[PDB]
Design a protein around this ligand. Structure first.
Ligand SMILES: CCC/C(C)=C/COP(=O)(O)O
Ligand SMILES: CCC/C(C)=C/COP(=O)(O)O
Ligand SMILES: CCC/C(C)=C/COP(=O)(O)O
Ligand SMILES: CCC/C(C)=C/COP(=O)(O)O
Ligand SMILES: [Ca+2]
Ligand SMILES: [Ca+2]
Ligand SMILES: [Ca+2]
Ligand SMILES: [Ca+2]
Ligand SMILES: [Ca+2]
Ligand SMILES: [Ca+2]
Ligand SMILES: [Ca+2]
Ligand SMILES: [Ca+2]
Ligand SMILES: [Cl-]
Ligand SMILES: [Cl-]
Lengths: 12, 12, 12, 12
């Protein structure tokens, strides 16, 4: 896997 | 953003 | 076997 | 990724 600090999907 | 052919999240 | 939802080969 | 000694897909 994840990126973005928002878990899976959302911001990469 | 997306990757994997399954849209957002899931497989990168 | 297959994996990945794309049949044989490709994504495991 | 591959397995089987036959490259991508085929035998895992
Ligand atoms: C592929 C290299 C970077 C990476 C793991 C993106 C996946 O991020 P997510 O959409 O937040 O799950
Ligand atoms: C950098 C590669 C990238 C945009 C990963 C995000 O892929 P997703 O988790 O399928 O949305
Ligand atoms: C052990 C997991 C397994 C059967 C992988 C083979 O996946 P494929 O390359 O998508 O055919
Ligand atoms: C997933 C762990 C084993 C693995 C990488 C299977 C993929 O093998 P292939 O279908 O020969 O490409
Ligand atoms: Ca992810
Ligand atoms: Ca994310
Ligand atoms: Ca995405
Ligand atoms: Ca995806
Ligand atoms: Ca297979
Ligand atoms: Ca596959
Ligand atoms: Ca493979
Ligand atoms: Ca193989
Ligand atoms: Cl997609
Ligand atoms: Cl499949």
């Amino acid at each position: 896997x994840d990126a973005x600090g928002d878990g899976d999907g959302x911001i990469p």
